[PDB]
């Protein structure tokens, strides 16, 4: 409970980092697709 309360900012930060990385990867993949079309 208290341990979960202390670890919740870390879990939220990790999830935010994961979402940021995944969005960046999808963005880069679409850019590579545009490069291949070119």
């Amino acid at each position: 409970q208290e341990l979960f309360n202390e670890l919740k900012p870390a879990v939220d930060g990790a999830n935010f980092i994961v979402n940021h990385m995944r969005d960046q990867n999808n963005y880069n993949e679409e850019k590579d697709s545009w490069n291949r079309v070119a």
């Binding site: 202390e6 670890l7 900012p9 870390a10 939220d12 930060g13 935010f16």
Partner: peptide, 24 residues
């Protein structure tokens, strides 16, 4: 638990930097 506290701080700092980069 100073080690876990410092790890929480590092993860929060990384997330804050990425959020600032997102706003930029």
């Amino acid at each position: 638990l100073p080690e876990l506290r410092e790890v929480v701080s590092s993860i929060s700092y990384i997330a804050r930097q990425l959020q600032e980069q997102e706003d930029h």
